[PDB]
């Protein structure tokens, strides 16, 4: 009866059951299937390995990120996860459980459609429903007007939502993202002596990362209190046992967010593309979208996000203006979070898109009902 | 070369660069290393805040040379 | 599930006549079902609709319903009269009315791209090309592919304020226009025709984005068409280029007034010009055509024996079934989006 | 550089403008003559509706460039 | 090492050249799940293929993707073909070369497709594709030749002259082992005995294999049976019971010589012989007549060799010389064949090598293996 | 679908006109509403309309190919094998007659509308003219479609004396296979060319009543029931026709004239066509075939008439109910062959 959520997340796919305050299972959203060799020589029709085991297995298999960037590349290497998903992960047969599921910001009209229908077809899902994953985690702060950064492994976007709609005009893309920050501290921490180059030591960078990293309130004041004090340096133990000093890197790396010149994009940072999209609405709305600017995803979880953007955006902003950065504390799963809630809503029961329905009128019957 | 420049934490951060090399270069290298930016760097050896423009020729700077840091607090 | 989804759609604050008629249609479509006892009814519904007439529609849907109350919900039923002595339509927020009319314009335009050998307008070239203010541009080139007509009808323009003077004099309607002139700026919209650009719409329905311009109501103008006609979106309020086509099509009627396909053809170009303007979003459908209604306008066609369309269609359901759906969505949402929030006021 | 405008009785304003000079400046340059606000002001070149945006130099406009002017009577 | 397949209607035997028998065997069904309830919390496991299908039968959903000698899925054929190149026989398809059988008269869009398949999906560094009795002719020895291939789902009747499989004669049969299976449970159920499921029908088949035989004469067999005790023969079925066959054991088979058995008005295999043979140039009856060699599972019955030719011995020319050739090791002569063939040192150049596959596409299966 | 479908097509009581019906189905089914494809359906509902099964089936095995990307092969093949066996059985075309009684209430319902049932009562004189002394003078006025019919199907009475010099030009009346035994009367609450005890949907049955039984000579060379098989034989063919066509071949060189002609004789002509067909006394290609012989149409081609000879633009819903009786009695022979064969195992 529950109706299972799921964010096909550009990195981490995320899913679980209404109720649940909590994404119960998160996995990468990586999938591969054997390189050489054949290795596949007794694997009895495992010609694919999707998930945990297919960074587990990585020399012996050849990895294609799907949902890289937000949008679903490869249909077929996505049902898998969807099936990982489904059977294997969350241990549920599709057809039992309506499926809210998650598009990015700008997702082309044909990209909806094939996961319409992937989802009655493939799973056979009772019902479903289609929706922006900022409109959701707006949906979690409760509210339904205001710009959404979501930031997560590929792909940031702005999207600013006026009454559930988010404003495709509006929607700004920064293809920068998590993942380029991990590489991002792997450079830096390189230069720093130790050597982060294998794609299994970026997974400890991660670590350091979110376990370490944070936002400097002034990049400038925080460098310096780096050199006139060791007070910023932190230590981790790599798994090797070697335990390494993190300082002036804690910040640096986040900092890659708000100015990407670190990383040789000359696009903007975060802070001005904010801006660059609520003034890319009338005038008459940007007023609520500076007083609500949730922020959504995992790179905003870094600590010092928040004080910092209001920082940065009350100064590319009218000096009247009543600037307001939102981070709740749960971000990371706020997209789906949100979901949790309208699958849960009763009045949503009758904005799902019922398998009669499709029968009707195909697979473009998405466009009708889930907006 | 191998010019030493010093934080006031006593760290030393080792910079290699010919002396037909502007000080705004020299500036811009340790940025690259530390992150620094170069307009919150003053650069002090043997008692006077480096101009930029001049090479590190005109102050005889030379090898390992120990030249100092004070990074520019401002904006707090 | 439609008896109480439909239920929780009249619950919405902001409905507007529009949209009753719209979901009550719907309501009465799906559940009466399609018994051809009752076809004449959704037929004159949705013929009133076009034409703006909501009070009749909405008495006949209250009624068609107090006979047929055996047959339906009186839930439903009872609610639909609560909420209708209220119903009122605001111009600058009929949604629900700018998507009904932007897809009307494609199927209008979609008709004349049968209904037309393009003829006309290759005979209304010679009427523009005297008629035009010296300081336009002949049109000299054939009119071909009907992409190549609206420009030429859209260059009519250019003859304003010059030559479309002398017929607006007469208006006593468009002395109550309600553009205000703040030359508030352009903005963008990825929404088509007359939808407004923060306004939700189909994903397939997407125009890509472009810089829609922004206008305003006086608001102190008294008879304004926009609370003379509460039931019209509101683009500017009335097309004063209206008069510049007929400055030239008064004379196309002259000049061609023996021609026996006279009254077919004056309304391949009165009713492009009503698609377009709907289309590319300069105007509405009453603001365009309640200024050509007017008893000035029509004595040059009566005097020569052209009725007019107006752009009525034979068939208009597939709007309004697309309609249908979007009230009902856009308000099945407005519904989530207060429990959502009674229950985000229920923490803490 | 004098371009005329011609007005709809036919009298010319003769202006003097550079090509650099945005539309937006034309318009208001004509508010100094003869008072027209710019904004009811519409000007008109080779069959086109000069746009505020674009340069002189955008639309060819030369040394006796008659550019024609509309103004509107949008009052009510 | 050379690798041989074939795609039979009911089995699928394999194995590697230069052997005399087929490492793996088995049936070519695959299956998918009927419910979502079993897939729940396996790894990709939408098909189990071969015996572990037939092993969960009830759990899935059964396809013979290459029931009647075509195949129909080309989606489940990759699964039966993987299955065997890599967890059957444990190879790994891009280092061995893989000679593949091909029904008679398979359209030329099968062709090319097959080939497709194997250079595509599983990167086959070389390929043939071989009619099935042509090869089931090789392994007899001879070039020139009828071959009465009979197996699970079609049985065709081949000629075959200088190596090249005419097309004009090649007559087919719907008539099989299954419909053999299931005449004998009919009839063993009329007897008494009750085989109707599925596990039933497993078992009918072992008393089918075992026990039947093909009778010279019916009617003189009838009898001995009405008359003796002679013919009745006793199998034990698995449930610990013991049952009593004897004139089925010579009806079931029969229903090849006389398929009326089946309602099928069809001609049996002693006429379907005849007329493509009569479908052919005199000049060659004569030595189509004198090379039947017969290739199957369902012409493993003993004594359908004799019958074979007290039939055509009388539906042909009284002068004629007929010889009905029955290898011993026939249920796997098709792959015999192939293991012949492929082992041959001039078969080094027949292969389809990957090379050309690209300068020419799929239809390079036309100019190469006919 | 892809079950339901060929679990049918297994029936061995196939004909042409199921195939194509029911094959019809499976592609709007599973095409869906592409419309791509929206031609291709409209034509075969004509081209089954007029009895031209055969291209019919190429057609549609042949859209298949080009569209078999789209859909399933077991079944595309079973049509593909089951298609170069079939045959129709004049005796039982079943489905045919179904669809045949439907269309002559479409056609019925046609006539009503256009018809201001002036050239009845302007038929009515050429009647009055040409009838046998025997027959009665209509001298009433037709008001009622009902009335149009009853005056129509009474120019029986004309036959044997002025039909005759009409029909021995013809050469495909020579060839008629009603057998001359009169086998009688058998009930029947099936409509029209419908036969007695073969099943029907509950709302299209009639009040019971006398039908006629009538049997097959087959021992006639050139049977119309050889030649076309296709037609379900209900009396072979109408000479009944040639009687019609004495008070026609009047009405046109009386009203040569007349401007509408055409649409006038094509309301008799598709009436009378209506009429047997739903009364029972012949199938359409029966009477059809009758006034399509060369020289029947001459008198239309001197006078200018166009026959339409019934074809209505829209058979879409007679094609509905069609494809329906097939789905039902094909899908009942299967459990009835299960039924048989679990109680083959009883007994
Ligand atoms: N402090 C932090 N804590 C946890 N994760 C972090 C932190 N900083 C950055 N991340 C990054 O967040 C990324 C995961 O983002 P998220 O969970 O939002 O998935 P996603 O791919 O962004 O999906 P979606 O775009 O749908 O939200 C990881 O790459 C991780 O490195
Ligand atoms: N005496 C027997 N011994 C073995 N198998 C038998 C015997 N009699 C009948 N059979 C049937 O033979 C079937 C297998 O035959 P075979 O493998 O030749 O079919 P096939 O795969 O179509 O072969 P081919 O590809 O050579 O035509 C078995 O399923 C069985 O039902």
């Known amino acids: 009866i529950a109706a299972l959520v799921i964010d096909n997340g550009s990195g981490m796919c995320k899913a679980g059951f209404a109720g649940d305050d909590a994404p119960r299972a998160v996995f990468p959203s990586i999938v591969g299937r054997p390189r050489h060799q054949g290795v596949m020589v007794g694997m009895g029709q495992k010609d694919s390995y999707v998930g945990d085991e297919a960074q587990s297995k990585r020399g012996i298999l050849t990895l294609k990120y799907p949902i890289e960037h937000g949008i679903v590349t490869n249909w077929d290497d996505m049902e898998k996860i969807w099936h990982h998903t489904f059977y294997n992960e969350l241990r549920v047969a599709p057809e039992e459980h309506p499926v809210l599921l998650t598009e990015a910001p700008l997702n082309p009209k044909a990209?909806?459609?094939?996961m319409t229908q992937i989802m009655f077809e493939t799973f056979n899902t009772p019902a479903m429903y289609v929706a922006i994953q900022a409109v959701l985690s707006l949906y979690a702060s409760g509210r339904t007007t205001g710009i959404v950064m979501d930031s997560g492994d590929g792909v940031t976007h702005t999207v600013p939502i006026y009454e559930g709609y988010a404003l495709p005009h509006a929607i700004l893309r920064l293809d920068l993202a998590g993942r380029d920050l991990t590489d991002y501290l792997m450079k830096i921490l390189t230069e720093r002596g130790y050597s982060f180059t294998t794609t299994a030591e970026r997974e400890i960078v991660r670590d350091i990362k979110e376990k370490l990293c944070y936002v400097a309130l002034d990049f400038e004041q925080e460098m310096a209190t780096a050199a006139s004090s060791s007070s910023l340096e932190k230590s981790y133990e790599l798994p090797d046992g070697q335990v390494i000093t993190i300082g002036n890197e804690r910040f640096r790396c986040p900092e890659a967010l708000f100015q990407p010149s670190f990383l040789?994009?000359?696009?903007?940072?975060?802070?001005?593309?904010?801006?660059?999209?609520?003034?890319?609405?009338?005038?008459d709305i940007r007023k609520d979208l500076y007083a609500n600017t949730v922020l959504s995803g995992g790179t905003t979880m870094y600590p010092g996000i928040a004080d910092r953007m209001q920082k940065e955006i009350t100064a590319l902003a009218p000096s009247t203006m009543k600037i307001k950065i939102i981070a709740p504390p749960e971000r990371k799963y706020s997209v789906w979070i949100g979901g949790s809630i309208l699958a849960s809503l009763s009045t949503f029961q009758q904005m799902w898109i019922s398998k009669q329905e499709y029968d009707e009128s195909g697979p473009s019957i998405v466009h009708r009902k889930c907006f | 070369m191998q010019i030493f420049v010093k934080t006031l934490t006593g760290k030393t951060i080792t910079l290699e660069v010919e002396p037909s090399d502007t000080?705004?270069?020299?500036?811009?290298?340790?940025?690259?290393?530390?992150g620094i930016p170069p307009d919150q760097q003053r650069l002090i050896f043997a008692g006077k805040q480096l101009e930029d423009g001049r090479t590190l020729s005109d102050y005889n700077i030379q090898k390992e040379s120990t030249l100092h840091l004070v990074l520019r607090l401002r904006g707090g | 599930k439609i008896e109480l989804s439909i239920s929780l759609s009249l619950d919405s604050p902001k409905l507007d006549e529009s949209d009753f008629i719209l979901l009550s249609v719907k309501y009465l479509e799906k559940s009466l079902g399609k018994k051809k006892e009752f076809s004449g009814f959704f037929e004159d519904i949705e013929k009133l609709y076009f034409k703006q007439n909501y009070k009749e529609a909405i008495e006949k849907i209250l009624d068609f319903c107090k006979k047929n109350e055996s047959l339906l919900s009186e839930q439903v039923v009872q609610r639909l009269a609560e909420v209708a002595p209220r119903l009122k339509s605001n111009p600058k927020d009929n949604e629900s009315r700018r998507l009904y009319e932007t897809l009307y314009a494609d199927h209008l335009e979609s008709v004349i791209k049968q209904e037309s050998d393009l003829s006309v307008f290759n005979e209304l070239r010679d009427?523009?090309?005297?008629?035009?203010?010296?300081?336009?541009?002949?049109?000299?080139?054939?009119?071909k592919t009907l992409d190549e007509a609206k420009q030429f009808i859209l260059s009519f323009v250019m003859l304003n304020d010059n030559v479309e003077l002398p017929l607006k004099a007469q208006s006593e309607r468009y002395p109550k226009k309600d553009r205000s002139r703040e030359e508030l700026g352009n903005t963008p919209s990825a929404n088509p025709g007359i939808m407004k650009p923060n306004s939700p719409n189909f994903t397939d329905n997407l125009v890509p984005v472009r810089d829609v311009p922004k206008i305003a109501i006086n608001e102190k103008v008294a008879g304004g068409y926009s609370k003379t006609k509460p039931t019209t979106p509101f683009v500017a309020s009335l097309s004063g280029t209206t008069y510049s086509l007929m400055v030239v099509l008064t004379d196309y009627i002259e000049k061609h007034k023996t021609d026996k396909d006279i009254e077919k053809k004056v309304n391949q170009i009165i009713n492009l010009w009503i698609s377009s303007y709907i289309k590319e979003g300069y105007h509405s459908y009453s603001e365009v055509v309640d200024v050509l209604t007017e008893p000035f306008l029509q004595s040059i066609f009566d005097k020569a024996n052209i009725k007019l369309?107006?752009?009525?269609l034979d068939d208009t359901h597939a709007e309004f079934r697309k309609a249908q759906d979007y009230v009902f969505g856009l308000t099945i949402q407005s519904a989530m989006h207060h429990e959502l929030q009674e229950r985000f006021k229920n923490k803490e």
Do not use: L, W
């Open chain 1, 111 to 114: 990209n909806r459609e094939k």
């Open chain 3, 127 to 143: 009427s523009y090309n005297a008629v035009k203010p010296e300081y336009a541009v002949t049109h000299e080139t054939e009119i």
């Open chain 3, 309 to 312: 369309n107006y752009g009525v």
């Open chain 1, 264 to 283: 040789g994009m000359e696009s903007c940072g975060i802070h001005e593309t904010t801006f660059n999209s609520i003034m890319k609405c009338d005038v």
């Open chain 2, 23 to 34: 000080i705004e270069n020299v500036k811009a290298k340790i940025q690259d290393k530390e």
